[PDB]
Design an enzyme around this catalytic site. Structure first.
Site, PDB file in Angstrom:
ATOM      1  N   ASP A 110       0.824  -1.203   0.000  1.00  0.00           N
ATOM      2  CA  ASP A 110       0.000   0.000   0.000  1.00  0.00           C
ATOM      3  C   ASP A 110       0.858   1.252   0.000  1.00  0.00           C
ATOM      4  OD1 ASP A 110      -2.504  -1.439   0.220  1.00  0.00           O
ATOM      5  OD2 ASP A 110      -2.063  -1.769   2.323  1.00  0.00           O
ATOM      6  N   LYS A 135       2.155   4.626  -0.993  1.00  0.00           N
ATOM      7  CA  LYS A 135       1.529   5.797  -1.593  1.00  0.00           C
ATOM      8  C   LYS A 135       2.088   7.042  -0.907  1.00  0.00           C
ATOM      9  CE  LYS A 135      -2.441   4.390   1.049  1.00  0.00           C
ATOM     10  NZ  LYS A 135      -1.965   4.866   2.355  1.00  0.00           N
ATOM     11  N   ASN A 140       2.003   7.713   2.853  1.00  0.00           N
ATOM     12  CA  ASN A 140       2.899   6.869   3.657  1.00  0.00           C
ATOM     13  C   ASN A 140       4.360   7.289   3.632  1.00  0.00           C
ATOM     14  OD1 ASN A 140       0.961   5.232   4.721  1.00  0.00           O
ATOM     15  ND2 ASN A 140       1.023   3.763   3.011  1.00  0.00           N
ATOM     16  N   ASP A 190       4.023   2.179   7.582  1.00  0.00           N
ATOM     17  CA  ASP A 190       3.095   1.071   7.321  1.00  0.00           C
ATOM     18  C   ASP A 190       3.641  -0.186   6.621  1.00  0.00           C
ATOM     19  OD1 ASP A 190       1.094   2.404   8.729  1.00  0.00           O
ATOM     20  OD2 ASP A 190      -0.063   2.930   6.948  1.00  0.00           O
ATOM     21  N   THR A 234      -5.895   5.532  -3.035  1.00  0.00           N
ATOM     22  CA  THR A 234      -5.264   4.212  -3.082  1.00  0.00           C
ATOM     23  C   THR A 234      -5.202   3.649  -4.487  1.00  0.00           C
ATOM     24  OG1 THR A 234      -7.285   2.985  -2.449  1.00  0.00           O
ATOM     25  CG2 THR A 234      -5.758   3.638  -0.710  1.00  0.00           C
TER      26      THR A 234
HETATM   27  N1  LIG Z   1       5.126   7.734  12.795  1.00  0.00           N
HETATM   28  C1  LIG Z   1       4.262   8.728  12.670  1.00  0.00           C
HETATM   29  N2  LIG Z   1       4.654   9.956  13.037  1.00  0.00           N
HETATM   30  C2  LIG Z   1       3.806  10.987  12.932  1.00  0.00           C
HETATM   31  N3  LIG Z   1       2.560  10.842  12.486  1.00  0.00           N
HETATM   32  C3  LIG Z   1       2.123   9.645  12.062  1.00  0.00           C
HETATM   33  C4  LIG Z   1       2.966   8.552  12.144  1.00  0.00           C
HETATM   34  C5  LIG Z   1       2.181   7.489  11.664  1.00  0.00           C
HETATM   35  C6  LIG Z   1       2.523   6.025  11.491  1.00  0.00           C
HETATM   36  C7  LIG Z   1       2.600   5.177  12.756  1.00  0.00           C
HETATM   37  C8  LIG Z   1       2.513   5.792  14.000  1.00  0.00           C
HETATM   38  C9  LIG Z   1       2.590   5.021  15.167  1.00  0.00           C
HETATM   39  C10 LIG Z   1       2.755   3.656  15.082  1.00  0.00           C
HETATM   40  C11 LIG Z   1       2.830   3.030  13.848  1.00  0.00           C
HETATM   41  C12 LIG Z   1       2.996   1.642  13.780  1.00  0.00           C
HETATM   42  C13 LIG Z   1       3.072   1.001  12.548  1.00  0.00           C
HETATM   43  C14 LIG Z   1       2.986   1.753  11.374  1.00  0.00           C
HETATM   44  C15 LIG Z   1       2.824   3.137  11.459  1.00  0.00           C
HETATM   45  C16 LIG Z   1       2.750   3.785  12.694  1.00  0.00           C
HETATM   46  N4  LIG Z   1       0.990   7.980  11.328  1.00  0.00           N
HETATM   47  N5  LIG Z   1       0.967   9.193  11.541  1.00  0.00           N
HETATM   48  C17 LIG Z   1      -0.221   9.988  11.268  1.00  0.00           C
HETATM   49  C18 LIG Z   1      -0.115  10.750   9.919  1.00  0.00           C
HETATM   50  C19 LIG Z   1      -1.353  11.649   9.707  1.00  0.00           C
HETATM   51  C20 LIG Z   1      -1.278  12.351   8.329  1.00  0.00           C
HETATM   52  N6  LIG Z   1      -1.281  11.297   7.292  1.00  0.00           N
HETATM   53  C21 LIG Z   1      -0.027  10.507   7.377  1.00  0.00           C
HETATM   54  C22 LIG Z   1       0.001   9.767   8.726  1.00  0.00           C
END
Ligand SMILES: Nc1ncnc2c1c(Cc1cccc3ccccc13)nn2CC1CCNCC1
Length: 448
Positions: free
Chosen positions: A130, A132, A135, A151, A170
């Protein structure tokens, strides 16, 4: 070991794939981290817990500067909590759209980082699927900041939601072989190739008026460099795109070999030795693209939020009603606080600020319900306005019917449906709407 013993939530960071992301803090050391909360109820698992636990343990041992770092994993009866490093630079594209100049060198540097992270994860037999723009996070909102891919590995263990709010954009990036069921790590090279194509032209290679149309073009797998702005791009960039967008995955180039590509070698040199004409039409196009994707996403979230607030208004009034043993419709601060807790303090005080500034006595709980909910929807209502203003690049204050067709297509709002609602909002509309009319359409598209 339980999550809440170790971490306190501090503020929400957004919704990402599979659930809500919260900025949290270690209760002992003060370390900030991001936590993704995955509802076992709302999100089906694909695999056995043993496979999930093993993959998580693997992910914790891995380290790469273009891959989000995972620290920890917790589980209770209702949720998984995945703890990792928080990145504060936002999504790559939201940065790119603010730039005045953007060349192939800037594209190459971005894409070398993505390929580097991907190459490392594929070595460890972890596939994203996924991949994109959403991510690709930045460590800071700067053209110089490092990219972190978020992700990786989640799609192997968790089933994706079919709600449109969750899957905007997506379709553009998904590999055709993923649509048909047999896929491996080569699908991530395809998604990267789609992203590269967009960086260099501002337009998706597989494009269409709605999800089905886009997917139908991906499945057919045919795309061109027909657009005018491809004349300003090296044959070398295009050659790599052809190899990354090769249909049959076994014929598609690897992430490792894409890093070795002449284009990457040549354009990611610290010392810029090559011509760097600003890809001006691509920036204008990427801005249109980002603006449209953000406005469609914002629109869906606004409709979602208006439904949620409708329920919660009803529940809250019911709750306060039960508590209202007097039947005089007035409660104190204490009672209002428990009532709001019951629904699921400083928010109560912000409401009372408006309701009774002096705090002379008791509060009409009905007036409290309004303010509580009629404020709490702010973030979605103001985010919606912000997306509308951003999409409206010429500051015309209006969106044309053509632009509505695009926005709603991307949003899976049926063509004949939104036009009917438009007609109800303004009999004498002239193929364009201001912000309030747009907001009126969205209210009517979610049963209001
Ligand atoms: N690391 C991050 N840091 C800041 N904001 C984040 C993230 C993460 C990813 C994330 C965070 C915590 C645990 C995780 C565990 C497995 C995979 C990913 C994780 N999402 N978002 C929110 C933003 C909002 C705007 N659209 C893009 C994403």
């Amino acid at each position: 070991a339980i999550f809440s013993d170790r971490y306190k939530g501090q503020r929400v960071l957004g919704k990402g794939s599979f659930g809500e992301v919260i900025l949290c803090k270690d209760k002992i050391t003060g370390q900030e981290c991001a936590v993704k909360v995955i509802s076992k109820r709302q999100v089906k698992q694909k695999t056995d817990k043993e496979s999930l636990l093993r993959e998580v343990q693997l992910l914790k041992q891995l380290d790469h500067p273009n891959i989000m770092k995972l620290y920890e994993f917790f589980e209770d009866k209702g949720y998984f909590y995945l703890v990792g490093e928080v990145y504060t630079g936002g999504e790559l594209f939201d940065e790119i759209i603010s730039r005045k100049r953007f060349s192939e060198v800037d594209a190459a540097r971005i894409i070398r980082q993505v390929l580097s992270g991907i190459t490392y994860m594929h070595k460890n037999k972890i596939v994203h699927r996924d991949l994109k723009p959403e991510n690709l996070l930045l460590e800071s909102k700067s053209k110089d900041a490092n990219i972190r891919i978020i992700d990786f590995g989640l799609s192997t263990h968790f089933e994706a939601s079919k709600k449109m709010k969750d899957k905007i954009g997506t379709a553009y990036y998904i590999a055709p072989e993923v649509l048909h069921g047999t896929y491996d790590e080569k699908c991530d090279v395809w998604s990267t190739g789609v992203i590269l194509y967009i960086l260099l032209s501002g337009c998706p290679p597989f494009n269409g008026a709605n999800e089905y149309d886009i997917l139908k073009k991906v499945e057919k797998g045919k795309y061109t460099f027909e657009l005018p702005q491809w004349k300003k791009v090296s044959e070398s960039a295009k050659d790599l795109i052809r190899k990354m967008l090769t249909y049959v995955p076994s014929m598609r180039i690897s992430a490792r070999d894409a890093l070795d590509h002449e284009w990457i070698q040549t354009y990611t040199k610290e010392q810029i030795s090559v011509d760097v004409p600003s890809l001006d039409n691509a920036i204008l196009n990427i801005r249109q693209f980002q603006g449209t994707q953000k406005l469609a996403q914002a629109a869906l979230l606004y409709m979602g939020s208006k439904l949620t607030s409708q329920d919660e208004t009803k529940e809250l009034t019911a709750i306060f009603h039960k508590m209202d043993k007097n039947g005089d419709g007035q409660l104190d601060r204490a009672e209002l606080i428990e009532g709001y807790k019951e629904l699921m303090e400083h928010e109560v005080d912000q409401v009372l600020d408006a309701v009774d500034f002096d705090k002379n006595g008791y509060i009409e709980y009905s007036e409290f319900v309004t303010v509580a909910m009629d404020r709490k929807t702010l973030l979605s209502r103001e985010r919606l306005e912000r997306a509308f203003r951003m999409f409206d690049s010429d500051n015309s204050g209006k969106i044309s019917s053509t632009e509505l067709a695009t926005i709603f297509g991307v949003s899976d709002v049926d063509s004949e449906t939104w036009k009917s609602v438009l007609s109800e909002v303004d009999k004498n509309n002239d193929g364009e709407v201001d912000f309030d009319e747009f907001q009126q359409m969205l209210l009517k598209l979610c049963g209001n």
